[model samples]
Target: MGHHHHHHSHMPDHGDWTYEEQFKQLYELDGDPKRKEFLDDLFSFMQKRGTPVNRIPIMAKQVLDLFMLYVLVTEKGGLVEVINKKLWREITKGLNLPTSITSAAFTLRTQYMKYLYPYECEKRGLSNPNELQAAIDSNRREGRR
Candidate 1:
C-alpha cells in the first residue's frame, strides 16, 4: 500500500485588466456602427461647442478616457445617473472653446471625485473631510480659548 498526502500552495487568481464591454469592443478594436454612432454624437458635441480639433484621433483619445471613466464609475455604482444625462453638458460647460486635455481631465476629475471617491471611501470604510474639519475646528477653538 503506497499512500502519499501532498498539500500544494495555490495562489489566488486575479483576472486580467478590468474594462467595460464597450472598452474592448470599441476603443482598442475597430469602430463599428455603435462606435460610429457614439463618435458621431461626440464629435458633433465638441464641434457644436467649437472645440477646434482638426484631428479626430485627439478627440478619440479624450473620448476613450471619458468612456473608460464612464465604465468604471458605472461598474463602481449605479449612481451618477445625472452624470450620464449631463456629461456632455458639464463637459462642455464653462468658457474655453479649445479645451486643454489637462483642463478636461480636471473637469472630469471633479465630477468623478464627487461620486466615485465618496463611494470608494465608503467601500474602504474611510471617513469624510468633514470629520477632520470638525476635529481641527475643535482643536482650533480650544487653542483660541
Candidate 2:
C-alpha cells in the first residue's frame, strides 16, 4: 500500500525571490512604458490643441504648485525656500513653456510665498493659513533686520 500523499501550498507560485526582486519584477510588468506613452500622447494632444492665452497663466501657476508639492514631499526638510535652475528647467519642460519664462522665476517665487504656501499648508492640515501668514511675516521681519 502506498503512503498517504498530502499537497498544501500557501504561498503564491513566484519561486525563490527576495522582496526587492519581486518588487522589481512587478514594477517592470506594470510600470513606466505605459505611463511614458500616456504622457507623450497627452503633451502631443495639448500642443496640437494649443492652450488658450488665459489658461497659460493658470496652467503655469498650477504647474508651479505641482513642482513645489514634489519638492516638499521628497526633500529632506519639506521646504521650497529656493527653486534651483535644474528644478526650474524641469518645471518649464513639464509645461512645454519657453526658456524665456525663466525671467519670471522671481514672480513665481512671490506667488508661492504669498499664495501657494498657505494654500498647501491649509490643505495638508499642517497649519491654518493665518499661521502660515504669520510665519511669512516673521521671516520678512528677520530678513529686514
Candidate 3:
C-alpha cells in the first residue's frame, strides 16, 4: 500500500484583515469644502512663497497632519489624552516620510502665523497681540505633543 496522509489542521492567523481594511480607509480623500479651501489656499501660499514644486505635496501632508492634530486637541478640550507618538510614527511611515519632517512643518506653521494669520486678523479688524500669542502658544503645545 502506497498512500499519504497530509494533515494541516492548525494554520496561524498571521494577519487581521480588519486592521488592514482600517489602515486602507485612512487614505481616503475628504470631500469637505472647508478642507478643500484650506488645502488650495495653503498650496497657493506655499507656491507663492517659493516652496519647491516637488516638495509641496510632501510638506502639505505634514502641515495637514499637524492641522488634524490641532483639531483633535481642540476637540478634546486643549489636552492630549492619548500619547500620539506611535500614531504619528505610523502616519509618517504611511507617507513614506521621516519623522524629522516635523521640523519643516514647524517652520511652515511659523510662517503662517507670521504672515497669513496676522493678515487674516487684520482683515477681520482684530489686532490683539494677546489673541495672536495665545493661538501661537496653542499650536506650539499641539506640535510638541
Global lDDT of each candidate: 0.38, 0.38, 0.38
lDDT tens digits, residues 1-145, model 3?
2222332222423221223232212123455665556545644665575651232112322333433433443333222221222143433344444555435434434433343332233334333556555555655687453
Candidate 3 clashing pairs?
none
Better of 1 and 3 by TM-score: 3
Per-residue accuracy of model 1 over 68-133 as CA lDDT, tens digit each: 443444443322332333333334332221333323433454544432334334444343555534
Pitting candidate 2 against candidate 3, the one with the higher TM-score is 2
**Which regions in candidate 1 have their CA more than 4 angstroms from the true location?**
1-30, 52-64, 74-145
State in Å the error of residue 108, model 2.
1.6
RMSD of each predicted structure: 18.2, 21.8, 16.1
Error of 1 at 137 (Å): 18
Using Cα atoms with residue i matched to residue i, what is each candidate's TM-score against the true structure?
0.26, 0.30, 0.27
**Candidate 1 lDDT:** 0.38
Candidate 1 TM-score, C-alpha based: 0.26
lDDT per residue (tens digit) for residues 1-145 in model 2: 2332432333444432334331233223336575444334433444554531121123222333333333443342222433322244444444454445534444444544443343335334444545544544554464354
Error of 2 at 141 (Å): 18
Candidates in descending TM-score order: 2, 3, 1
